[PDB]
Amino acid sequence: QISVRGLAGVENVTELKKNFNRHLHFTLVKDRNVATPRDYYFALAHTVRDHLVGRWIRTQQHYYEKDPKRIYYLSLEFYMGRTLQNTMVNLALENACDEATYQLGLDMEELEEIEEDAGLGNGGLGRLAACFLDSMATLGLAAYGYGIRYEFGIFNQKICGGWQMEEADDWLRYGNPWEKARPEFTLPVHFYGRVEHTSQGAKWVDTQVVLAMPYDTPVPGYRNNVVNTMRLWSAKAPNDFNLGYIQAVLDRNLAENISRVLYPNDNFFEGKELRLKQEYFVVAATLQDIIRRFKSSNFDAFPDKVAIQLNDTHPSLAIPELMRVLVDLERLDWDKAWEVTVKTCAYTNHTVLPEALERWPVHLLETLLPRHLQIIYEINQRFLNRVAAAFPGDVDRLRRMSLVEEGAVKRINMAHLCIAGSHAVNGVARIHSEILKKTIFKDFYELEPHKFQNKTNGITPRRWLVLCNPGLAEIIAERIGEEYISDLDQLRKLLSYVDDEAFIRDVAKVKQENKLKFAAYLEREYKVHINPNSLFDVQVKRIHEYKRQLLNCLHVITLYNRIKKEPNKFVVPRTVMIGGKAAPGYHMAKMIIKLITAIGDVVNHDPVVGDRLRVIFLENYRVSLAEKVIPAADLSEQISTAGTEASGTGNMKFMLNGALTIGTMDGANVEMAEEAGEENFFIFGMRVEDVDRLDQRGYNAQEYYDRIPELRQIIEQLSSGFFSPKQPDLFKDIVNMLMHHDRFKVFADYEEYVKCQERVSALYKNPREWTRMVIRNIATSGKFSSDRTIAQYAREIWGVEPSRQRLPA
Amino acid sequence: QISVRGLAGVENVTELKKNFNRHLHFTLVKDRNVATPRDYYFALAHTVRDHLVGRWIRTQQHYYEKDPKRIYYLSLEFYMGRTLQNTMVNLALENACDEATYQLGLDMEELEEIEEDAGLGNGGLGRLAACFLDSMATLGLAAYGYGIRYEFGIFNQKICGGWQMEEADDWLRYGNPWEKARPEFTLPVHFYGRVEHTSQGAKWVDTQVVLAMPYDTPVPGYRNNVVNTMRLWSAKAPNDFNLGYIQAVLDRNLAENISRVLYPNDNFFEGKELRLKQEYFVVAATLQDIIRRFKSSNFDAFPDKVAIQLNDTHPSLAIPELMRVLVDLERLDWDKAWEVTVKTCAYTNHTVLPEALERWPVHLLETLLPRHLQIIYEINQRFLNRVAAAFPGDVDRLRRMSLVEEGAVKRINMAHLCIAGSHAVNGVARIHSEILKKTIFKDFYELEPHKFQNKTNGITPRRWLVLCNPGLAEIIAERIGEEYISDLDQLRKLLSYVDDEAFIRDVAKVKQENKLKFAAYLEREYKVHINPNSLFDVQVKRIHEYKRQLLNCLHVITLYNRIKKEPNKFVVPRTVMIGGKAAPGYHMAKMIIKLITAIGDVVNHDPVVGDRLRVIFLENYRVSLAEKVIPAADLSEQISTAGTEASGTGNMKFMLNGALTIGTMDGANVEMAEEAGEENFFIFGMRVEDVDRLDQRGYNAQEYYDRIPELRQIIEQLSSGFFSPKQPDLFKDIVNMLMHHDRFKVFADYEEYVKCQERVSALYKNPREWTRMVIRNIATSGKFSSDRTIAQYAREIWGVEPSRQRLPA
Ligand SMILES: Cc1ccc(-c2cc(=O)c3c(O)cc(O)cc3o2)cc1
């Protein structure tokens, strides 16, 4: 129907239908009479997968022929979402498949909805990995995603009585048609044991073996016929394992638990053994695989053929592991092995928040990875010797920079390990990268300034525009062509259309259609009635104190109280939608969810309010829900305390999809405002500098409570039980935190937020000027493409040249 | 090459090759350069599976159209072995696939060897299920095998220092291409809880739910285009299960352990909770499925549409479960529900050995299945009331016949439950069925003589002749045609060829070729040197006291001692091969294995012996090894104490494949000797009557030790450490048992065994007369086809007529 979805040729369509009917019969062992919609999804999935195979084989063949430098993206998270539509998009099969299925009397949209999300990630960090894979394939890089095939991904979130409940994400129940098991590439991973010092170096012995079995998933580039690989490792017990008999067999589960479940913490460190096992498991299996590929091309050339990107410190053990292989197994001298390691590895930092910092107790590493600890101590000694030589007598520096933290229990700072063992350390937005150099890694910067880079995050415009927002994609394509999808900078051409009446009409029309479709989706799946003519005010992201959903809650209650004070005065109608998962053990995050729903219970049922104000908690926020709600959004809420949100990526998704941003000068917000112009952005609140000023003198929340009557009223309402009639003291922990222990200074930004929100409403009253500002945002969103990001990684870190040239089909 | 393997048409071969190359590419994502032999096996497996699909869909469709009476074979064991060759055989694709693969430069035989056995069984009972499925498909019955998809089947057996070691049978590691998951047919199974008595009857509440997910495997009939279903249930935890968070996810394993591992006990009851869970799980999921199919055709008609065969007492809970559904859920009156149950269910008994009898502690059923216990007590009360009325004043009868056994702990006799709740009780050989009526079920017979039947066991001639012994199949086909494969009685026509020089030559030639091939197989896979001109003396079956491998050991040591006494005297050369698995906790069985190997260590390394005597323990005896060694055998050892082996089926396999039988008048041996003639059988030892005579007066083993010098020498050798120089007392437990606690009277049969073995050797010296006797055996083996067995089940128990008519392709 629409052009950017590709051609529906008579040949293609005939062929797709034939193969659909083939798979239904032979693959699914079903006829048309007994088939469920799930069968139909599977038939289509297999049919589309068939188009990947040739390209997948050719691409891997090609990388063998040409032997390019290989990029290894190590992450414990790949937040992939659904694969079907994305595959169709990148292969240009969407319209053909739409037509083929239509003729079979099926709605492709309905079939797409049957696919489970591969939710093998928590949030930003995980989704960045996913976007990166897409971009790396699109830019023709010989790149491999390496991670863990979790049996269970991020929990499914149910709301029960306004509270979050967690359900196991059994995503593999019905099978995964996208993966291919490679049992022939199974590799041993070792744990426990002890170190033995012989004549011929150190030997790790008496270990427990877990096997790592790889599953390969294709990563198609955008219309270039490149298909890269995501390899995820599954834990399998050896056959001699525990080998009364029955219990031995049952106890194989112990070993296989390693790949069982994704830890559901966002920007939080939990020092659990099972977590460390996951970290070693992925690192050990990957490095063996890397080295095997390399040897089928001495170690001098390793860094010319291998780049390893560490996604946060989660795979930091790659550094000691690479040393261990090089020193203990390959018998290189320390210094040479170290050179190779440093020149191979690069570290991306994702946050400065201290509770996220991985600091592993020594006693844990001692038991689990005895050899790796020795190697870490050796790295620490040699590193600290360089520091001593550069800064003679600066004993405090030595203490601050040590990989080993002294204290109650000794810990390893994995971030320090990463900086020491990497040739490049990058942040994920300009302000974040600057903060790293100014604050938490100041000492490291002073020693090795050359290591520290910026690589501002991005999002794939494939998933995050073409896929989720085809109507916007099309109207843009009608003006400026299709080239922009793989070259997002071309969106600037839209600036010359800012005074075009037809384009203004189109932008606004697409937004209205998206809103209608989302409001419909709500009624179908979660029976709730929302006004589509209202401003869609959405905050979707993990629930955190630092992300300040609470600040949003305060505004929501403010609007409510203002309506009640003056019922018969006009206000711009809003639907306020907040969505996100709390980590299961994060009490405050779980309380915030409850507050959100508790406000809804009051606001949504007040006759005086009408449909002027609605508060909706979006249940089970995940990738596939982001694809629905983001296109439908008017106002993007990016309201973290300045200095807390390293980058964000949600911010970029909304900008690309025609929502305006209300936000702080935090993370990539700063660069978005820079690109679009401050006049086209609803910037409010303290800057980083302001927060520092407040910290130096001390943050007294009472002062704000005393001086802002509107704020006082809200706190009195929370305390007295206005929002919890049956349990008047329900929200005492919220009030107490805001008043006495608020690290994120919610009250400090309250006044500027509310005022700035008034300005949003004022602009919304003028549809034409709203839409013109929207155009200025979309048209300057080009920088925030992961294509740009990966291009910068490739040139400035990995030392490879990206390519837009197509492989032969 | 050979005719019974079907046509290799130019069209067929071209088509198979095209589809092989298709699957390699699309299914396995491999090209010819990277493919392993395992890939090639998989490509062929998928290609052959493609030929099943059409027939599978049509057959199930047909059963919906015609709505025939449905047979449900409930077993906890299906010893299927490999599927590929069997599928090819039954579809007539063998030669075409041989040709197709040959042209692709591959050896099909090598690819076949890559397939894992589906070892979801222990021995006789399990293999009988498998043969039955084949026969039921071949005889056009609307039949379904129902069982458990164990993640791990019967352990793989390694010999280490002459001792059995067990390894996990991880048969699903590389995937199973034969199964199809049916998640849409997932069903809840309940455990624990408590009973609540309301106004409207009893209610089972507060239960723990496990889900049962079915996997369907095709069962092709022989060349009739019928494909029946084996449905095996897998345990899956519900998503709300245990739903800190991490542990909850990990604890899903608890629930899934139900389908994890097959209990590796042969004819032995182990009263473990996990075992009872397996028994309820398969019964609960199956009965729901049966009832669902039935309702898509009141309960009056259930037995006209449903037969349920219980394979031993393992699925005895089907009786209380059917009552529970009918009474508690469907709200039928007790008496009517009972009528339906009895008319639906039939019980096959597999042994009289008391340690095999399932006697479940009440406290276990009380906790796990509270409602089923109440129903059992109710059955018991009503049953005992009928007994009281028939035998007034016979209080002892009441005690003997009770479903509930009084004692230290109360137990339920599941065999009593089965007799009470079934319209038919059958043994598995004439002598066994008679023993049931005379001894262990005398009381039950006296009450309901009409219930007790015989159904002598059989083996499928497809697997056990055509598949494993194509050369024998062919030479038979050259004379009498191919019809015999589905009508084994036609083998009688071979009696008219007993004096044909050409046929005698052919029978002997095939035997020699089989021996050469097996002797080769030994060298390749287990580097050992055997004389192919020797008599192949084989005993393969589970290791048991009752099966008397020990008696065989005594003979072996006797031959050895005789050679040593007179080195320069001629003896017929023998290779003695004993194979079988011991249950992991069966100490005596594990000692016997050790003795066997210990004899080998002495005999096989004695220079004086030469190649006149070799003792080989066949490692990892399983279905696929039976297919190799049985065709190669000359003498079949069936030497159980009379009254112990209910039937046996190994006996029949050897008879079909041109080995002579040395054996006791036990089990089906009696009928084999009857069919072939006693003069064509090496019958020795006590009859049942003789054993009874010995028991009445008492078995004193000392008497035999005192009177038989040859026997005394052997016992002195065992005791003094002739066979265990380093550990002189290794075999004290063997000696002590034989002397003082031998339930199986090894010494009593010793003299007649050795003498009868002398007669075997004498006949072997005359090849022509040996072969003529072989022909008389093969030619009278027709009765022992499972086709005959199933035909008798169908007519005399199930009330359905078998059919040899083909379905349209
Ligand atoms: C700034 C900031 C960041 C993260 C957190 C956080 C995140 C968690 O997931 C979390 C948890 O699972 C258990 C717990 O006891 C505390 C926790 O705290 C708090 C504050």
Ligand SMILES: Cc1ccc(-c2cc(=O)c3c(O)cc(O)cc3o2)cc1
């Ligand atoms: C006649 C007869 C039959 C079966 C057995 C038998 C079989 C077993 O599997 C077994 C076992 O696993 C553990 C054990 O302690 C004893 C056992 O005894 C013994 C004698």
